[PDB]
Amino acid sequence: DLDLAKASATDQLKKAKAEAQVIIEQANKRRSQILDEAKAEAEQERTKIVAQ
Amino acid sequence: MNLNATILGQAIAFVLFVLFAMKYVWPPLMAAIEKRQKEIADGLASAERAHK
Numbered sequence: 001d002l003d004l005a006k007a008s009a010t011d012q013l014k015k016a017k018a019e020a021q022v023i024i025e026q027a028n029k030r031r032s033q034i035l036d037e038a039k040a041e042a043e044q045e046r047t048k049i050v051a052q
Numbered sequence: 053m054n055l056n057a058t059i060l061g062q063a064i065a066f067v068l069f070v071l072f073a074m075k076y077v078w079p080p081l082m083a084a085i086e087k088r089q090k091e092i093a094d095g096l097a098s099a100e101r102a103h104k
Contacts, residue, residue, distance in 0.1 A: 007104035 001099035002102050005099075
């Protein structure tokens with residue numbers, strides 16, 4: 001029981017520590033994706049309107 | 053039957069046996085079984101604490 005408890009504690013700590021970091025990093029990736037998309041499409045729209 | 057001064061010599065023998073047994077005999081015994089019970093109980097307690 002002592003061995004199972006220590007092993008499970010380490011396993012769950014490692015898993016949560018990895019998963020939360022992954023989630024936050026990919027949230028930063030999504031934020032950057034949205035920012036880049038907006039930055040490109042702003043000038044795309046302006047370039048359409050001037051030709052109009 | 054007939055009372056005799058044997059009443060006194062056995063009174064010496066009895067007190068001598070009582071003193072020697074009280075000092076040396078009892079304290080070493082009963083330690084081992086208590087140690088067994090404490091080992092089982094503390095192993096259970098520690099395992100259940102780690103389970104919690």
